[PDB]
Design an enzyme around this catalytic site. Structure first.
Site, PDB file in Angstrom:
ATOM      1  N   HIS A 181     -39.430 -54.330 -25.682  1.00 14.55           N
ATOM      2  CA  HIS A 181     -39.010 -54.214 -27.065  1.00 14.55           C
ATOM      3  C   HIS A 181     -40.059 -54.649 -28.140  1.00 14.55           C
ATOM      4  O   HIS A 181     -39.783 -55.449 -29.069  1.00 14.55           O
ATOM      5  CB  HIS A 181     -37.661 -54.881 -27.212  1.00 14.55           C
ATOM      6  CG  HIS A 181     -36.534 -54.044 -26.697  1.00 14.55           C
ATOM      7  ND1 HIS A 181     -35.940 -54.263 -25.471  1.00 14.55           N
ATOM      8  CD2 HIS A 181     -35.897 -52.972 -27.239  1.00 14.55           C
ATOM      9  CE1 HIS A 181     -34.982 -53.362 -25.283  1.00 14.55           C
ATOM     10  NE2 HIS A 181     -34.932 -52.572 -26.343  1.00 14.55           N
ATOM     11  N   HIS A 201     -42.868 -49.633 -28.108  1.00 17.19           N
ATOM     12  CA  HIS A 201     -41.495 -49.071 -28.096  1.00 17.19           C
ATOM     13  C   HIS A 201     -41.146 -48.466 -29.454  1.00 17.19           C
ATOM     14  O   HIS A 201     -40.559 -47.378 -29.518  1.00 17.19           O
ATOM     15  CB  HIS A 201     -40.424 -50.107 -27.650  1.00 17.19           C
ATOM     16  CG  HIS A 201     -38.999 -49.665 -27.861  1.00 17.19           C
ATOM     17  ND1 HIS A 201     -38.354 -48.788 -27.014  1.00 17.19           N
ATOM     18  CD2 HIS A 201     -38.085 -49.997 -28.815  1.00 17.19           C
ATOM     19  CE1 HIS A 201     -37.113 -48.591 -27.441  1.00 17.19           C
ATOM     20  NE2 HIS A 201     -36.926 -49.310 -28.534  1.00 17.19           N
ATOM     21  N   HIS A 218     -36.711 -50.439 -35.983  1.00 17.93           N
ATOM     22  CA  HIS A 218     -35.376 -50.552 -35.408  1.00 17.93           C
ATOM     23  C   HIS A 218     -35.171 -51.723 -34.444  1.00 17.93           C
ATOM     24  O   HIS A 218     -34.039 -52.149 -34.190  1.00 17.93           O
ATOM     25  CB  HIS A 218     -34.992 -49.236 -34.748  1.00 17.93           C
ATOM     26  CG  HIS A 218     -35.485 -49.104 -33.350  1.00 17.93           C
ATOM     27  ND1 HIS A 218     -36.715 -48.565 -33.046  1.00 17.93           N
ATOM     28  CD2 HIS A 218     -34.920 -49.450 -32.167  1.00 17.93           C
ATOM     29  CE1 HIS A 218     -36.890 -48.584 -31.734  1.00 17.93           C
ATOM     30  NE2 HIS A 218     -35.817 -49.118 -31.176  1.00 17.93           N
ATOM     31  N   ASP A 254     -34.101 -43.708 -28.957  1.00 24.22           N
ATOM     32  CA  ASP A 254     -34.198 -45.054 -28.407  1.00 24.22           C
ATOM     33  C   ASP A 254     -34.427 -45.140 -26.907  1.00 24.22           C
ATOM     34  O   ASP A 254     -35.093 -46.074 -26.446  1.00 24.22           O
ATOM     35  CB  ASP A 254     -33.039 -45.944 -28.801  1.00 24.22           C
ATOM     36  CG  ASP A 254     -33.451 -47.380 -28.846  1.00 24.22           C
ATOM     37  OD1 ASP A 254     -34.672 -47.639 -28.706  1.00 24.22           O
ATOM     38  OD2 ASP A 254     -32.582 -48.266 -29.036  1.00 24.22           O
TER      39      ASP A 254
HETATM   40 MG   LIG Z   1     -32.283 -52.141 -29.801  1.00 17.45          MG
HETATM   41 ZN   LIG Z   2     -34.918 -49.951 -29.226  1.00 19.79          ZN
END
Ligand SMILES: [Mg+2]
Ligand SMILES: [Zn+2]
Ligand SMILES: Cc1ccc2c(c1)nc(CCc1ncc3cccnn13)n2-c1ccccc1
Length: 324
Positions: free
Chosen positions: A79, A83, A117, A228
């Site tokens: 993360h 990413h 995000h 995502d």
């Molecule tokens: Mg997330």
């Molecule tokens: Zn994410």
């Protein structure tokens, strides 16, 4: 709280023009920002420039902004910065391939949203911060990481000479802010199953009106989800190594649970290395496939995403069956 970029960084970013051998590469859905870390910030600019023209944002201000976002991504295995860009790219590939369903206002809102995000992600789960017994989770009790994620953007946006949405009417800003809000929230995976069951319905009673806002917000929501998890949609060897990147986070979270004498779930337990294949097959089946299936259904031009998913699934299959 906040972190910012230096003049060195940002003025290096303006000076960047993307190699030509990569122009057609980047327009694919399966494209892999992998080997160009170097290039990542500039890629985000290149994409912004094409999607929204080279005069949606004051170059100086956008560059400063992108670099600062980067400064707020932690060095965690999954993360992290990588990413954020990979996800953003994917949103770009989708915007580009539906070049008329979305407003200029969403297009910029959305690419921005993706970049932000998972901002200041700690590598711990919403679950984990709630479970025991974090300060962050005693202010955002629902969709914790996500709300934080949004608060970050909003503080970054308000930093001196970063505000890239400045030259918009103060209710067109109080609009693109509102898009981004929902955008990031939609990536709370828990929210996705609800949201995707809803769409599934709407579509299949011919009742999904892109004219009605709360309908827009839903599809956008799924798109965010779809980007995502898009690790799943790159070519096999890419996807392989990204998976390594995910369990490294999970297993770290899971180790911290063990340390406290407890039983991490099978996913975050490293003493379960080789349950993974099937884990993945599971994921793909109950999560990825329905995701891309419903997004293919709504926005047909995104079928190349569903195809790379299927291809990857039966690769995890060969792996479980013992032939890869
Ligand atoms: Mg997330
Ligand atoms: Zn994410
Ligand atoms: C032992 C084990 C067990 C289960 C597992 C597992 C590993 N791994 C997963 C899914 C892991 C994951 N969460 C985000 C992403 C994004 C890209 C790839 N994987 N991925 N589940 C799973 C499967 C089905 C449903 C939910 C989770």
């Amino acid at each position: 709280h906040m972190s910012i970029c230096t003049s060195e960084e940002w003025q290096g970013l303006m000076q960047f023009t993307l190699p030509v051998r990569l122009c057609k590469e980047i327009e694919l859905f399966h494209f892999d920002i992998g080997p160009f870390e170097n290039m990542w910030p500039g890629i985000f600019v290149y994409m912004v420039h094409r999607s929204c023209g080279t005069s949606c944002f004051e170059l100086e201000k956008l560059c400063r902004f992108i670099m600062s976002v980067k400064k707020n991504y932690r060095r965690v295995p999954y993360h992290n910065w990588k990413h954020a860009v990979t996800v953003a790219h994917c949103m770009y590939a989708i915007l580009q391939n539906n070049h008329t369903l979305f407003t200029d206002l969403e297009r910029k809102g959305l690419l921005i949203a993706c970049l932000c995000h998972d901002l200041d992600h700690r590598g711990f789960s919403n679950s984990y911060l709630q479970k025991f017994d974090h300060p962050l989770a005693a202010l955002y009790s629902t969709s914790t990481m996500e709300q934080h994620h949004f608060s970050q953007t909003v503080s970054i946006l308000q930093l001196e000479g970063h505000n890239i949405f400045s030259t918009l009417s103060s209710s067109e800003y109080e609009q693109v802010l509102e898009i981004i809000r929902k955008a990031i929230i939609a990536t709370d995976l828990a929210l996705y199953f609800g949201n995707r069951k809803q769409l599934e319905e709407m579509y299949q009673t011919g009742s999904l009106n892109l004219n009605n806002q709360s309908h827009r917000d839903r599809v956008i929501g799924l798109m965010m989800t779809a980007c995502d998890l898009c690790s799943v949609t790159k070519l096999w060897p890419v996807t392989k190594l990204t998976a390594n990147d995910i369990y490294a986070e999970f297993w770290a979270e899971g180790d911290e649970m063990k340390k406290l004498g407890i039983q991490p779930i099978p996913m975050m337990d490293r003493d379960k290395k080789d349950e993974v294949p099937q884990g993945q097959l599971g994921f793909y089946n109950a999560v990825a496939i329905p995701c891309y299936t419903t997004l293919t259904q709504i926005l047909p031009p995104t079928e190349p995403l569903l195809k790379a998913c299927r291809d990857n699934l039966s690769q995890w299959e060969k792996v479980i069956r013992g032939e890869e």
